[PDB]
Design a protein around this motif. Structure first.
Motif, PDB file in Angstrom:
ATOM      1  N   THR A 258      39.466  29.465  67.702  1.00 41.63           N
ATOM      2  CA  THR A 258      39.756  28.182  67.263  1.00 41.63           C
ATOM      3  C   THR A 258      39.650  27.313  68.536  1.00 41.63           C
ATOM      4  OG1 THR A 258      42.042  28.175  67.758  1.00 41.63           O
ATOM      5  CG2 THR A 258      41.314  29.256  65.636  1.00 41.63           C
ATOM      6  N   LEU A 259      38.986  27.587  69.666  1.00 40.77           N
ATOM      7  CA  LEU A 259      39.040  27.072  70.914  1.00 40.77           C
ATOM      8  C   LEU A 259      37.706  26.101  71.130  1.00 40.77           C
ATOM      9  CD1 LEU A 259      40.574  26.712  74.039  1.00 40.77           C
ATOM     10  CD2 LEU A 259      38.560  28.749  74.512  1.00 40.77           C
TER      11      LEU A 259
ATOM     12  N   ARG B 272      36.905  27.032  64.684  1.00 41.94           N
ATOM     13  CA  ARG B 272      36.949  26.897  63.368  1.00 41.94           C
ATOM     14  C   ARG B 272      38.202  27.066  63.062  1.00 41.94           C
ATOM     15  NH1 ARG B 272      31.316  30.139  61.571  1.00 41.94           N
ATOM     16  NH2 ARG B 272      30.081  28.871  62.948  1.00 41.94           N
ATOM     17  N   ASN B 273      38.708  27.076  61.643  1.00 44.14           N
ATOM     18  CA  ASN B 273      39.752  27.432  61.095  1.00 44.14           C
ATOM     19  C   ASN B 273      40.217  28.644  60.548  1.00 44.14           C
ATOM     20  OD1 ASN B 273      38.992  24.102  59.914  1.00 44.14           O
ATOM     21  ND2 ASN B 273      40.944  24.485  61.058  1.00 44.14           N
TER      22      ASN B 273
ATOM     23  N   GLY C  68      47.809  23.323  74.380  1.00 52.97           N
ATOM     24  CA  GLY C  68      47.336  24.142  75.418  1.00 52.97           C
ATOM     25  C   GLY C  68      47.635  25.677  75.313  1.00 52.97           C
ATOM     26  N   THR C  69      47.820  26.096  73.976  1.00 52.31           N
ATOM     27  CA  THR C  69      48.421  27.516  73.627  1.00 52.31           C
ATOM     28  C   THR C  69      47.369  28.321  73.262  1.00 52.31           C
ATOM     29  OG1 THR C  69      48.217  27.249  71.389  1.00 52.31           O
ATOM     30  CG2 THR C  69      50.427  26.320  72.312  1.00 52.31           C
ATOM     31  N   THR C  70      46.112  27.833  73.029  1.00 53.58           N
ATOM     32  CA  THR C  70      44.877  28.770  72.939  1.00 53.58           C
ATOM     33  C   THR C  70      44.182  29.153  74.157  1.00 53.58           C
ATOM     34  OG1 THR C  70      44.322  27.853  70.906  1.00 53.58           O
ATOM     35  CG2 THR C  70      42.718  29.050  71.712  1.00 53.58           C
ATOM     36  N   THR C  71      44.375  28.063  75.272  1.00 51.38           N
ATOM     37  CA  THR C  71      43.886  28.524  76.682  1.00 51.38           C
ATOM     38  C   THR C  71      45.012  29.315  77.355  1.00 51.38           C
ATOM     39  OG1 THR C  71      43.105  26.353  76.891  1.00 51.38           O
ATOM     40  CG2 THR C  71      43.459  27.184  78.772  1.00 51.38           C
ATOM     41  N   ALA C  72      46.076  29.407  77.010  1.00 50.34           N
ATOM     42  CA  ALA C  72      47.168  30.241  77.677  1.00 50.34           C
ATOM     43  C   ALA C  72      46.867  31.419  77.202  1.00 50.34           C
ATOM     44  CB  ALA C  72      48.547  29.709  77.448  1.00 50.34           C
TER      45      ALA C  72
ATOM     46  N   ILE D 275      34.629  28.657  75.250  1.00 53.57           N
ATOM     47  CA  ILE D 275      34.421  27.385  74.649  1.00 53.57           C
ATOM     48  C   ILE D 275      32.651  27.414  74.511  1.00 53.57           C
ATOM     49  CG2 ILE D 275      34.057  24.970  75.346  1.00 53.57           C
ATOM     50  CD1 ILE D 275      36.722  25.101  76.294  1.00 53.57           C
ATOM     51  N   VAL D 276      31.937  27.929  75.522  1.00 52.79           N
ATOM     52  CA  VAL D 276      30.668  28.232  75.135  1.00 52.79           C
ATOM     53  C   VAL D 276      30.069  29.046  74.158  1.00 52.79           C
ATOM     54  CG1 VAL D 276      28.705  28.714  76.418  1.00 52.79           C
ATOM     55  CG2 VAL D 276      30.188  27.321  77.493  1.00 52.79           C
TER      56      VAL D 276
END
Ligand SMILES: Nc1ncnc2c1ncn2[C@@H]1O[C@H](COP(=O)(O)OP(=O)(O)O)[C@@H](O)[C@H]1O
Ligand SMILES: Nc1ncnc2c1ncn2[C@@H]1O[C@H](COP(=O)(O)OP(=O)(O)O)[C@@H](O)[C@H]1O
Ligand SMILES: Nc1ncnc2c1ncn2[C@@H]1O[C@H](COP(=O)(O)OP(=O)(O)O)[C@@H](O)[C@H]1O
Ligand code: BEF
Ligand code: BEF
Ligand SMILES: [K+]
Ligand SMILES: [K+]
Ligand SMILES: [K+]
Ligand SMILES: [Mg+2]
Ligand SMILES: [Mg+2]
Ligand SMILES: [Mg+2]
Lengths: 524, 524, 524
Positions: A29-30, A35-36, A87-91, A453-454
Motif C-alpha cells: 500500500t506504499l 493498492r488496497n 508515515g506508518t508504512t514507511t516505518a 515505491i518503485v
C-alpha cells in the motif's frame, strides 16, 4: 501452562518469517501506486483500506513464534500512528529492512549488541542531518501540496484543508465527519458555540427558521439549579426597567420558573431565553467562567459567597446577538476587554503543556479555539459507506500531515531525503568493526522506502535507486508521472517530523529484535 | 484470532467467484420474463420472491474469501433499495459487469487506480447525459404506464395507483396493507383522522352503526389529564346555554368526570363525546396544536399559563360534523382561516427538510397529509399468504417507481437509455492509456442490463444488442412480445432517478473492488 | 488422584534434564556479551529481557519429573532476587554446576549425604574468605563504576545514580519510573512533600503558575473532620490579629467551612489554604505527628483530650514557605528544634529493625527520608515501550547493586573472586573421603561463572580459565575488550553481598537436590 523453548537460529528464522508476513501485507500500500487491502470484520461488511496501521492491527498468525515476531514489529506502526498520525508504512518498511540486514550480519559471527550500538549512532546522526536539511512550510501553496500528497494525490482535499487552515487560524481546530451529499463541504463557525438549545419551544419569536434571536441581550450566568422563581425577581425587574432582552445560562430550569418565563415572554413584558450550561462537572464550571470572561460578567455561585437575589446589572454580561436553535447556542460579538481573554488563553496554554492524556489536551484546544480562534468542520461526501470510510481516512491523514508540516517544516519526498542523509553519513565510524557493520546496516536500510515505491509502480527499483543516488539536491523520481526532476518544484513534499519519527521508531524496535537468542512461548 | 492472508491474483479469483455466486442468484429475476427465487426461513414457510434486494440479503457462503466478495457486492443492492426503492437487480448486473471487465484489464498489467479514475469520469459524464435525456412525467397515463411496468406488467396495479395519486394529491401519502378479499381495493380518507375512539359506549346515539355523530360541535382541546369535574363546569354550562354539542379531546378522562358526562348526555342536557389525544409525548403536543389550527381553537395547557376553569367560548374550536367509532375519530370541514393552515404546513416542511431518519420524515409527511391533502390505503387481495406477500412486494415496487417518476421524469426502458448514453460518450478520453481503458470498461458495462433481459427470454443477447445499437432515438426491443419498436409509444418507461442511482452505486462499489491486492480473514 | 513413582537413576536423569532446560535458557544472558530472551505474554506484546529471574519465573515443562527439576532449581533465582536484587544468573549457573558434578559423584557410588556435608563445609569456608577479601566502596567513582557494570556497561546510568546518591544522602530513597522524553532525567525533592493539593481552586493567588504560595504561615494540624465553622473561629481571629497566613491540614473540610474560608481569603481578611491529611488510618496519624514534629506544633485530636476551640498560637506550627499545587503540598524550611527530629527518626529506625514485610519497611524508610534526607526520582527515557521496559529493568538492577556495594563493599568481578577463593581453599578436608569429594565438587563448581562469561563471548573458556588461575591478585580477563589486566583499575567491580548470596543459595538448593532417591508426581 507448559512452555515451548527455542534457541538461536531456529527462533530467529521463525521470528523473521512472522515479520515478513506482516511486512509483506503492509507494504503493498506504499506510494501513489499502492493498492488496497480488504479486512474482514466479524460484525459488518469488510473494510477496504490503504492505511498501514489499520492493516497491521489485524494480523495474527497461527504459529506462535511467528506470531511473536509479527506482534513485536506491529508496535512500530502503532507508535508512528500515535506520534505523527502518518508515515506508518514507511516505518514498517524501514524496520523490516533493518531486521533483515542485521540478521544477515549476526549469522556471519558479529556481536549483536555492538551492531545495535552502531545502528543507534547512525540513527542519531541521521536525525541531526534531517533537522539540518529541513525548510519552513508556511505559505498556503505548500500546505496545499502537503495535503494533496498525503491524500493520495487528491487536489480538492489539499485545497479544502488549506482554505480551512487559512480561515480558522493558527489557534483553531478542524474535524472530519461524515457528509450527506456527494461533494465535500466546509462549514466554519466563528464565535462561541455550545451544544445546548432552548428549554421551551414557546420562546421562538421567528417561526420561519424556528430560532430564537436576541439583539444586545444580558447574559445571566447562574452556577446553580433554579426551580423557584422567587430568586430571579430582582434581576428580572431590573432588566424589564432596562428594556432589552435577557438570556439565562443555568444548570437547569424547573417547571415553575420556566412557566413564569414563557408566560412573561409572550405578554411582551420581558424577552427571556433559557438554555442549559454545557458540560458536566469541573469542565462545566470552567466553560461558564470562559463565557463570563468573554461576555464581561460574573458567575453567580454559592461556593464563592454570592446569592442570585443580590445580583445586579454589573454581574450580567452583554453581547451583540444571540441565536438559539433546537441544538446549538451561539454568542456573537460579545463585549470583553482583550487583556482578560489573552490572560485566560495563556493560562489554558499552561495546563495544555501540563496535560498527559490526548483527550484532555484536545478538550483544552477546543476551549482555546472557542475563546480565541474558530472551529471548522469538513464533511466528506461519498456514494456508499465503504467509499465514505476510505475517503474519510484519507482526509484525516492529510489533516495530520498538514499539521506536522506546519509545526516542523518539509523535506523532499519520495524517499529522497533519507537517501541524501545516508549519502552524507558515509564517513561515520564507531569503536569496533561490529559497530561499523551496524552503521552500514542502518545506512543501507535507509534506501528501502524508495525501492518499495518503485516496486509498487512495476519499475526496476535498483536502476531508479542508482539514478537518484547519482544526483544531488532535491533531484528525485516522480512515480506518478515516471520521470526525474526536482522534488520541491513538482510539489512532492514530506514533513520532517514524519520522516524523523518513522526512522526513530523503526530503529528502536529493530535494534532490540536483532539481539534475540531464545524464545519462550506456550504449546500448540 | 489467527488470520489467513491471500495476495494478488488468488485473492482476486476467490473474490470474483463470490461476486459471481451472488450475482448469478440475483440476475435470474430481471425483466418481464424473469423467474422467482425460493428463500428458506427458519421460522415459517419459505418465501417466493422476485425482488433483487430480498435475494441479495439472504446469500452467505462457506468459503471466507468468496464470502468477502459477496458481502461487498451486496451493498450495491442494499443502497439502491434504500435510495430509490427500486432498480436493485440492474445495479447488481452493472456491478458484476464492471468488476469482470476491470479484473480482465488489471490482469493485462494496467494500474487499478487509473482504471478507477477513468470509470469515475465515464460515470459522471453518463449521469449528465441521462439528466439531459429525460422528459417530464406529469399526466395520469404515463404514471399508469410506470406503475404497470414496475408491477411486472400488471395493468390493474398501475390503474389503481394512478387513481390513488389523482384522488389524494401531491401532498398526500399512500400505504399498502394486506386485504381480506380476492380483489384489490382502494380506500381514501378525506379530512383529519386519528386512531382514538370514544371512552364510553353509552355515548352512542346511533346504535344502527355503533357510531357517535355530532353536528357543528365545539372542540375543547385540553392538554392535561382531567379527573375531577370541578375544573370543567363553566365550559359545560356555557355550551348548554349555547345549545349545540361539545367534543373533548384530552390526555385522558377518569371515572368521575366520564361518569358525570355520560349521565348528562343521556338526560338530554348536553351532547358530550370524549376521546383521547393521539400520540405519545411531543408528537402528541404537535397533533393537538394541528387540530387547534385546523379547527380554529386554543390549546389549554398549564405550561403556557391558562387554566381550564378560565376557558371561554373563544378557546373552543368548531367543526361541521364529527363521527367517532370504536377505533377512529374524524373531523370534517373544520372552521379555520386558511393562512394558519398554510403557515403550519410550511413550518412542517421546513422541519421536514431538516430531518435525518426516514421514520421522522414520514411522520411529518403524515402530518402534512392530514392538515392539507389526504391519506389513501391500498389493500392487496390474494387467495393465500405466499401469493399475498409476492403481490404486496410488487405493489410497493410500483408505488416507489411512480413517486420517483413524478419527482424526476422518465427515460426509455428495457436498458435502452444506458445504450444511448454509452453511444453518446464514445469520444471521452482521460489523461493516460489506463484511464482510457477504464472509460471503455464502463461504457461496455452499460450494455449488461439489456443483454440480461434478452437472455432471460431465451433469445440471443448479442443479435438484439446489435440491432438496438444500430437504431436511434427510443428504438428498442419489447421483450414481452418479442418485437422492435418505439419504447415510449408502447409504454415501457423507467424513472430517471432509478437508472442514475443504479449506475452511481454500481460504479462506486466496483471501482473499489477493482483496486484490491490482499485479503485478510479468519482461519477455517 | 493416581500417582507415578520413579526410583533412583531414572528419577535423577529426568530431574537433571529439567534443570538443564531451565539453566540453558537462563544462561544465555550472562555477562557483557549475553543476549536477550523474548517472553510471550497472554495479554499484550512480548517482553524482551536480559534478567535471570524474569526468564526463570516463566519456564514450565511438559514432563512432570522434568518439571519438578525445573521448579526446584527456580527457587535459587527467586531467592537471590529477593535477597540482593542482583546476581540471579550467576546463582543459577553455580547451582547447575554443583548439581551436575554431584550427580556424577553419586553415580560413582558415593554417599549423597556426606557429599552434601562436604559442600556445606566448603561453602562456609568460602563465605569467610570472601568476607576477608573485600574492600570498602565509599567514593563516588567506585559507586559510578558499580552502577555502570550492573547496567550492562552504560556510563550514563552509573553517573546519574552516583549523582542521585550524592545529592540525596545516606538516609534518602531513590525511585525509578517511566519518563516522557528520550533522555534520562533526575528530579530530587528537598524537604517534606505529601501528595494532596488544595481543596478549592479559589485559593490560588498566583495564576501564572496555578500555585498557592504562602510566606511564613501557621500550620494548624487538626486530626478531626471540620464541617461547621463555629468550632474554628478563634484561631482565625487570632491569626487575623497576627496578620500572617495560615494553612489547615485536616482529615477533610466540608462545604460550609470551605466556603467561609474561600470567601474570606479573596476579601483580604485572612490568607488561608486547606489541604487533606496524608495517608489512610494509622499512617495518617503518624505522618501528622511527623509534620507536627518538623513544624514545632501539636496535633489537635480528641483521643488525647484537647479541643480545637481551645487552641492557641502555641498549638500552631510555623514554616518559611508553603507551596501547594493541584496534586502536592510542599513545606520548606520549617522551624523545629533538632533534638526532636533526631529522636523521631531514631524511633522510626527502631520500628524499622522490627519490621517483617518489605512494604512496611519501605514506607518507614520513606518517612525517614521525608523527615531527615531527601527523595529522588529517576525517569527513564526511551522511544517505545519494549525499550522502556528493558532500560527500566537495567536501571533498577544498577540501583540495587549500588546499594549493596555501599552496605558491604566490592570484590573483583568477572568471576575472579570465586576463583581466588577456591584457590585459597585448596587444602580443606573433611571427615571421610565422601566429604572430600564434596569439597572438591564445590571448589570445581566455583569456576562456572567465568567460563560461561567467556563462552558467551565466543572465546575458549578453558584457556582463559587456565590463564586467570595462573595469575594472582585481581588479575583477570576483560570480556568487553578481550584483554587481560587488573580488574580494579579497569573498574569491573561486584558487590560482596551479591557474590556471597549467590553462592549460599545455590549451594543450599543443589545440596538437597543431590540426595534424591525417589520422585512421586501425578499421571500424564
Ligand atoms: N508522485 C510521487 N512520486 C514519488 N513519491 C511519492 C509520490 N507521492 C507520494 N510519494 C511518497 O510516497 C510515500 C507515501 O506513502 P504512504 O502510502 O503515504 O505511506 P505512509 O503511511 O508511510 O505515509 C511518501 O513518503 C511520499 O513521499
Ligand atoms: N416489455 C419489456 N420490454 C423490455 N424491457 C422491459 C419490459 N418490461 C420491463 N422491462 C425492463 O426490465 C427491467 C425491470 O427488471 P426488474 O426485475 O424490475 O429489476 P429492477 O429491480 O432492476 O427493477 C426494467 O429496467 C425495465 O426497463
Ligand atoms: N567487561 C567485563 N569483563 C568481565 N566480566 C564482566 C564484565 N562486565 C560484567 N562482567 C561480569 O558479568 C557478570 C554480570 O552478569 P549479569 O548478566 O549481570 O548476571 P547477574 O544477574 O548474575 O548479575 C558479573 O558477575 C560481572 O562481574
Ligand atoms: F429487483 Be428490483 F427491485 F426491481
Ligand atoms: F540476571 Be541478574 F539479575 F543480573
Ligand atoms: K499506506
Ligand atoms: K427483479
Ligand atoms: K542476566
Ligand atoms: Mg501518509
Ligand atoms: Mg423493480
Ligand atoms: Mg545484575
Amino acid at each position: 501452562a507448559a512452555k515451548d523453548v527455542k534457541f538461536g537460529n531456529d527462533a530467529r528464522v521463525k521470528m523473521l518469517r512472522g515479520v515478513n508476513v506482516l511486512a509483506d501485507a503492509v507494504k503493498v500500500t506504499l506510494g501513489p501506486k499502492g493498492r488496497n487491502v480488504v479486512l474482514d470484520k466479524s460484525f459488518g461488511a469488510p473494510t477496504i483500506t490503504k492505511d498501514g496501521v489499520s492493516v497491521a492491527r489485524e494480523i495474527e498468525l497461527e504459529d506462535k513464534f511467528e506470531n511473536m515476531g509479527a506482534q513485536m514489529v506491529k508496535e512500530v506502526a502503532s507508535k508512528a500512528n500515535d506520534a505523527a498520525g502518518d508515515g506508518t508504512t514507511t516505518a514498517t518498511v524501514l524496520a523490516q529492512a533493518i531486521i533483515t540486514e542485521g540478521l544477515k550480519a549476526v549469522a556471519a559471527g558479529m556481536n549483536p549488541m555492538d551492531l545495535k550500538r552502531g545502528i543507534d549512532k547512525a540513527v542519531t546522526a541521521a536525525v541531526e542531518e534531517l533537522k539540518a536539511l529541513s525548510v519552513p512550510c508556511s505559505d498556503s501553496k505548500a500546505i496545499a501540496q502537503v495535503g494533496t500528497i498525503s491524500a493520495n494525490s487528491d487536489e480538492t482535499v489539499g485545497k479544502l484543508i488549506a482554505e480551512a487552515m487559512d480561515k480558522v487560524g493558527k489557534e483553531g481546530v478542524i474535524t472530519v465527519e461524515d457528509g450527506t451529499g456527494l461533494q465535500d463541504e466546509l462549514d466554519v463557525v466563528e464565535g462561541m458555540q455550545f451544544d445546548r438549545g432552548y428549554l421551551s419551544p414557546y420562546f421562538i419569536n421567528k417561526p420561519e427558521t424556528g430560532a430564537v434571536e436576541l439583539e444586545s441581550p444580558f447574559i445571566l450566568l447562574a452556577d446553580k439549579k433554579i426551580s423557584n422563581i422567587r430568586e430571579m425577581l430582582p434581576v428580572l425587574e431590573a432588566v424589564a426597567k432596562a428594556g432589552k432582552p435577557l438570556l439565562i445560562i443555568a444548570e437547569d430550569v424547573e417547571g415553575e420558573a420556566l412557566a413564569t418565563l414563557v408566560v412573561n415572554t409572550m405578554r411582551g413584558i420581558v424577552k427571556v431565553a433559557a438554555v442549559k450550561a454545557p458540560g458536566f462537572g469541573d469542565r462545566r464550571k470552567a466553560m461558564l467562567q470562559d463565557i463570563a470572561t468573554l461576555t464581561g460578567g460574573t458567575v453567580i455561585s454559592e461556593e464563592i459567597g454570592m446569592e442570585l437575589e443580590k445580583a445586579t446589572l454589573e454581574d450580567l454580561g452583554q453581547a451583540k446577538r444571540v441565536v438559539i436553535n433546537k441544538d446549538t447556542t451561539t454568542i456573537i460579538d460579545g463585549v470583553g476587554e482583550e487583556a482578560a481573554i489573552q490572560g485566560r488563553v495563556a493560562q489554558i496554554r499552561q495546563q495544555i503543556e501540563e496535560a498527559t492524556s490526548d483527550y484532555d489536551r484536545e478538550k483544552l484546544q477546543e476551549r482555546v479555539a472557542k475563546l480565541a480562534g474558530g472551529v471548522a468542520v469538513i464533511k466528506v461526501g461519498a456514494a456508499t459507506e465503504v467509499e465514505m470510510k476510505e475517503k474519510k481516512a484519507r482526509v484525516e491523514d492529510a489533516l495530520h500531515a498538514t499539521r506536522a508540516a506546519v509545526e516542523e517544516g518539509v523535506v523532499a519526498g519520495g524517499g529522497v531525503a533519507l537517501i541524501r542523509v545516508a549519502s552524507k553519513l558515509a564517513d561515520l565510524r564507531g569503536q569496533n568493526e561490529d559497530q561499523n557493520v551496524g552503521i552500514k546496516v542502518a545506512l543501507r536500510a535507509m534506501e528501502a522506502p524508495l525501492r518499495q515505491i518503485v516496486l509498487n509502480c512495476g519499475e526496476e527499483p535498483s536502476v531508479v535507486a542508482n539514478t537518484v543516488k547519482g544526483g544531488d539536491g532535491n533531484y528525485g523520481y516522480n512515480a506518478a508521472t515516471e520521470e526525474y526532476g526536482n522534488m520541491i518544484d513538482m510539489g512532492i513534499l514530506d514533513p520532517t517530523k514524519v520522516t524523523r519519527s518513522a526512522l526513530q521508531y523503526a530503529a528502536s524496535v529493530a535494534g532490540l529484535m536483532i539481539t534475540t537468542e531464545c524464545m519462550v512461548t506456550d504449546l500448540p
